Amino acid sequence: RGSHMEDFVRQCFNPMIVELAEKAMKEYGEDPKIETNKFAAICTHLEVCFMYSDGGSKHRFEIIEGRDRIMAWTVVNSICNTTGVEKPKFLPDLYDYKENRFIEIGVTRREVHIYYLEKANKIKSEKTHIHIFSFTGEEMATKADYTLDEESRARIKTRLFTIRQEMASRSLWDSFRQSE
Numbered sequence: 520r521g522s523h524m525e526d527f528v529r530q531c532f533n534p535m536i537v538e539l540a541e542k543a544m545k546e547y548g549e550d551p552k553i554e555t556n557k558f559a560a561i562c563t564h565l566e567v568c569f570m571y572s573d574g575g576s577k578h579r580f581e582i583i584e585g586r587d588r589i590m591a592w593t594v595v596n597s598i599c600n601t602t603g604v605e606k607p608k609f610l611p612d613l614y615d616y617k618e619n620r621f622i623e624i625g626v627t628r629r630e631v632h633i634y635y636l637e638k639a640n641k642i643k644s645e646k647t648h649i650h651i652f653s654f655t656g657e658e659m660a661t662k663a664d665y666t667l668d669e670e671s672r673a674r675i676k677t678r679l680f681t682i683r684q685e686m687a688s689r690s691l692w693d694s695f696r697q698s699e
């Protein structure tokens with residue numbers, strides 16, 4: 520069963536983040552033992568979402584990603600019913616209470632252009648904000664409004680490149696890149 524990538528995920532990411540990624544994957548019919556690359560991807564996505572939510576003020580953000588499906592939909596419903604934003608057709612990652620909008624965080628191994636295009640093609644209601652980070656240090660946000668200040672985003676990018684380096688050191692990076 521076991522594989523180097525799984526052990527690396529378990530040693531590289533926080534135990535709560537690993538448990539959350541595992542729960543989400545099982546809930547969505549995936550297997551972290553076997554789909555180890557997706558395992559790493561959802562751990563990374565979770566960490567990015569958490570760091571981003573940490574980048575604002577105390578009450579700045581409401582974290583949607585990481586919750587189970589029913590509760591996540593419950594909280595976006597409460598947010599829509601108290602603010603007036605439209606219901607996103609698909610579950611986002613965050614809600615900005617200062618900018619009053621949902622945020623879709625993406626982490627990509629390819630050019631941010633392609634991935635942002637996909638995310639803007641699925642999200643029909645253009646109300647929800649979109650913010651892509653890449654594993655090379657590029658980033659791309661909707662209307663060039665990158666929400667957080669420079670230092671928080673740079674912290675995210677540094678960590679992303681650290682993960683990429685740790686993967687390449689174990690010869691795990693080529694497989695990870697040629698999997699998205």
Ligand SMILES: COc1cc(CCNC(=O)c2nc(-c3cccc(C(F)(F)F)c3)[nH]c(=O)c2O)ccn1
Binds near residue numbers: 557561625626
């Ligand atoms: C969570 O586990 C899952 C989830 C689903 C559907 C729900 N998903 C999201 O909400 C979502 N998912 C990703 C993502 C997940 C795995 C891999 C990758 C990629 F990096 F390889 F592209 C991206 N990224 C986001 O930004 C994002 O919002 C289905 C199966 N498993």
Ligand SMILES: [Mn+2]
Binds near residue numbers: 610611612
């Ligand atoms: Mn999400």
Ligand SMILES: [Mn+2]
Binds near residue numbers: 611612624
């Ligand atoms: Mn996302």
